[model samples]
Target chain A: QLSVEQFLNEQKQAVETALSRYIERLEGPAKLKKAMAYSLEAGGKRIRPLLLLSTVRALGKDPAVGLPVACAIEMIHTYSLIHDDLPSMDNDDLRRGKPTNHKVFGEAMAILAGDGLLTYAFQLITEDERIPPSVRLRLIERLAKAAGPEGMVAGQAADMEGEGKTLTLSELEYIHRHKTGKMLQYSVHAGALIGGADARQTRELDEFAAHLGLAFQIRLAGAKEKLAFHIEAAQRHLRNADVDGAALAYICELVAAR
Target chain B: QLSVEQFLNEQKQAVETALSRYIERLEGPAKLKKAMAYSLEAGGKRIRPLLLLSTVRALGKDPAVGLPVACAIEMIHTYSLIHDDLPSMKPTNHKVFGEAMAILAGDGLLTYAFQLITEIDDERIPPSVRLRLIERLAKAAGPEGMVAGQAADMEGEGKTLTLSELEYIHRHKTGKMLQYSVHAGALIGGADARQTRELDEFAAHLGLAFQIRDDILDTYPALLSLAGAKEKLAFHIEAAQRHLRNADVDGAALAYICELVAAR
Candidate 1:
């Protein structure tokens, strides 16, 4: 009975507030802590955490787990963006329509701020007393895998290496899958884990996420040809034959929504 | 019975080999993975892991529980070193990898350590205990513990620091992990509440002694020649061991812990 678009808009508000509260609790110099909050509050679409929250809600679990998990993921996500725009990295001056962390905080503090956020992600999750210890541990493992070297970091490295070169479709897929797909898929999987989704259910949702994530990147690039195929693939695993899964469709629009 | 030094040597060898094995089978790119392993293999004495192992063995539990936990601690330790050597924390001789990648390297190791702790799959270790281990480890290494210490150490740079101030810095930066390393060891090895307290005391004295001796060596290498440091180390070493007497376990194996710190 839930409208998909409305859920997302609500999720955005809830998650944005969550990120702010999460950063408020950070312990360090004001300079460093402020730098950490700078990019975070500058307001990217809180899509990553929302995706996680959405998945948890879809599976009928308390979406509160999403607050810590989503916050942690957002921290990791914020950190990546901060580091990505470092002078030595992509060196972008602007992120989320604000001066980047390095731009405002200076290079060293910016890096420390990123480091601070990243480690806090791990630290805060351990304190989330709501999630069962077992479930929390599993979430930690999943996040680490998606964000670790073989996951986001490796994709980042691959992207760094693959830049300015003609990459094959598989190479591009590898970059996208590891860089963005793994984490997005992890959101679904973590939601599944918390929701106590069975193995078969997890597999279907992951498959959906893989295609949908790629579709997101593709569609945002204004390439609709391949995008439709991924969306069609994503739809097959939406798990409901009735009412056409507005929740899943709303997820697609969020990723490419301007 | 193995001598204290000999016991420490075995633990050290085992930990180093396990770390090598762990890194050897790591799942990542050659370059990035290599960056991850680089500082790990840079090889300071393996005392941190050894301390955890010693606590595990002393508690009469399977020393193997120390495997993942101990390695995880070492990773935290190494990652801190990498961060310290950065322009952000405190610059060391960071030459091999450039600035950009080193940050990522530290990032990778920190992430990987959490991954290792949470992914540990021993059924003997309860989920709650696993959670406790991760929670404690993260607190000891995260913002309030090690990271706070790092910030203090960084901000305190170029300023005259009091003994108490330095103690505060050392306690958080290095001492928290030292305490947790033993605490975790005891927790994993099944220490009761009383025993955990005593071991914590032992770790505290040991930490202060270790840091004081470090200052001695750095501040007056030739003038002092470790004589004064040695005496102070022995006194705290005795005090540390004194706390261990409250426990009903054999003092022989634990005495070696004193020797490990005594030589410092």
Candidate 2:
């Protein structure tokens, strides 16, 4: 009888602990590690990782198997945040009410710290011997596609170009889907793969994740009716997937409320 | 049958062909891809990829098996060069594409390198080997390896440095990836444990020698004097050759690379 709130709290704690341990064991320049650790440990809701671990739980398996990837996703998220905060990018002075990475460490170290974290994410995935090599390769392939040139990077490039330009709704959707939705979608798919979902379950859960991911962006853009449609679509897909998805359903409702 | 120079030429061409083909297939922001391609296609002697291919060939295997990784290493190298040339970081990529695009380009290249490795589908290279290659590439390119080296090198700029400190920086920064090229090729070519061990030593010495010669050619101050740097280079070259010989491979092509690094 665990509440979703409690589930969230436990998953958050688990992810943060793993994240800290991974960074602590990294052997690198003291300053570089500090900068990386700083951004990684900088407060965030751990939403993406929670989505991942919870999806594993939803699929009727222990969520523990998903911890490695949960941490990897968080690392990739943090690296993007650090890079986005650089002077050439968003140029933000603060993140999560603290000095941004480039602000705390110099820009040079910040860049390398981001680089270190991004590279380490892939390394960490491969290092997890608990997972089968074939599965690990699949995860790596999906994660890279979600974050690389054709995914988040493409979104980021489009985002940069759209600044101060009149972008069509379609163009905006492309940015949001690629830049943010890809990773969120990947988290769910990763969970599905890890949980060993069957073909139909995989297809259903993917639609659920995609709808949920789009709902997030729609809500952010303040499209209330559209958000409602996506939110409902997500619930429908999750219900049809026919696994124990209480945690996932709860997440969808929370996102709707937000 | 073929001279090392001829072998080097063929391998370089092979690597370039794959590198271009990989980028062409990538679907992304046009500007981002262009920036990545511009820097990637820029002539850099293709030294790292050549070392990897030649190592495989030296093992008496067809070097085609090594192409995926050879291209991957070059991508990583190009990524580093792009970032190193950033406005804050420094780079020619930035000069052409502007800082923002250049950063994205570098990020794309770095991420793409791992993507390329994981996507390798050849049955000859098992998933286990692919995983191992990704693991090794990440280590060589990631924090504990080249990034650490770059950070240390940046920190030491305009400051006096001890010989050990300089070596520490070079060893991590440039040396790690150079070593990765050889070490990865060995793994791909299925070297025995003893051969792997020998090549490890060979790569270590050769990596350092390359860096030392780099300094000498640029005509540097001492950590070692110019003459002393050259002497150190000679020592490392000899040591690397000895290790290569012990591995019992046809190492003429690799040896040619040594001479090329020494002279150039």
Candidate 3:
């Protein structure tokens, strides 16, 4: 009985609610907890979780089942950002228009905050009794594969090493794909799978996500000049899914604005 | 037909094997891996893992079930040592009888090592097998606990604190039995509630003995002065096992060292 607009708004609230609840549940020394909240609440698009919710909707299912998974992905992403900004790491002073976690909290507390968030993410997913144990285990395994050595961290190491050096196109793609693409893909894939998408829809959605992800990176790399052409290509894909004109227009405008 | 000496020797070798396997499996930047290896291989008594193993033995069960848990516990401990020696943390130039490797090794390994411990994927065991152990590890290693202890230690450095404060720091810092290490052994030992309580006693006594011995080593002027400390620690060890209605009276070498320091 919910309109699509109402449904999407509800999903947004779910993502925000999950993030707030997670930050609330984290117990620690005041400094560390504050430091963690500082980074976690630093406003970003929350795009990855949004993509998760979108994918779940696209699969013709309720988005609530994927809410915990969405929250976990965001936490992992935020923790990496916090650590990446540490003095020992990228040493960046700003992220998302505010002081980086280490800049705000000092290095030690920032490090502990990232650690706390990372551990808390796992605890949230595995211990949430609302989700079936089998489903939770599957989510945990997929998450581990995404975050572990061969996934996000490996890409991070490569990116770290590649800094100050000219990377080949393939190498750049590889790094960005792992560093950014894996989590995004996992976010959408987990959403679809957990929401009971059929195999065909899942594969097609994965292709759409992969292309969308690559386009996002390309735009970051200054491919905005070609944004119009990519928007047309994106529309062709959207048409295949019977997406509404309004939804497609919004996505196209957003992509073109990049 | 294994002699007690042979049995102890085998146990020691098993501990070594577990440690070695863990290091070998660490995949990362070569420098980070080597840095992790340096601290992990740096000699210590391996007492925490050994406590688990001993508890398992006393409970009349195979110790293999506790192997991964033991290795992971030591890795957590070693990672802390690495971080504690970092310039930002303790700023020490030497640790475990050598030049600090913080500069060469980097904080990445310490961070990564912790991540490694938590992501363990041993599917052969029951899914719930290490859940409690994992929870314990998280509690011990997190901000309100070991990390807090480290912060306190850093804050208190070069300033003399009250004995109670010092004891409080030491108790939380190192006294809390890394539950994973202890509980895994108890689980393997098929320990009943009473035996589990006794093992808890053993772990607490052993922890205090080791902690106080470390304190004495840090503060005492000479090794011979340790005798009195050892005698006092013996009382702790006896209390640990006193409820068992049978005590390993001869198991006093660790305590004897403490007494030797006290006498000095």
Judged by lDDT, which candidate is best? 2
What is the alpha-carbon lDDT for the whole of candidate 1?
0.76
Q: lDDT per residue, candidate 3, B50-144, as tens digits? A: 66665666566666666666666676677566656655552232352222233223233323433443444553444454454554565666555
DockQ for candidate 2, please give it: 0.84
Candidate 1 residue runs with Cα over 4 Å from true position = A26-28, A162-168, A219-222, A240-245, A256-258, B88-94, B219-238, B248-254
lDDT of 2 by residue, A98-161 (tens): 9999887888889899899999999989987577889999999999999999999888878877
Local accuracy of candidate 2 as per-residue lDDT tens digits, B44-131: 7888899889889988888988898899899999989888877575238887777778888888889989888887776467789889
In candidate 1 chain A, what residue range of length 10 has the lowest lDDT sum?
A: A239-248
> What TM-score quantifies how close candidate 2 is to the native fold?
0.97
Among all windows of ten consecutive residues in candidate 3 chain B, which has the lowest summed lDDT? B96-105
DockQ for every model comes to 0.54, 0.84, 0.22
Q: In model 2, which residue pairs have backbone atoms overlapping below 3 Å?
A: B84-B90, B85-B90, B85-B91, B86-B90, B86-B91
Task: Name the lDDT value of residue A150 in candidate 3.
Answer: 49
Per-residue alpha-carbon lDDT of model 3 for A108-223, expressed as tens digits? 66666665666566666655546555555566656655665446665666666655899899878777777787787777678767767667666655665665666666663446
Which of the two, 1 or 2, has more DockQ? 2
Kindly list the per-residue Cα lDDT of model 1 for residues B34-125, writing each as its tens digit. 77677887667766787888888788876776788888899888888886786555233246666666767777788888888776665477
User: Rank by lDDT, descending?
Assistant: 2, 1, 3
Interface RMSD for model 3 amounts to: 4.8
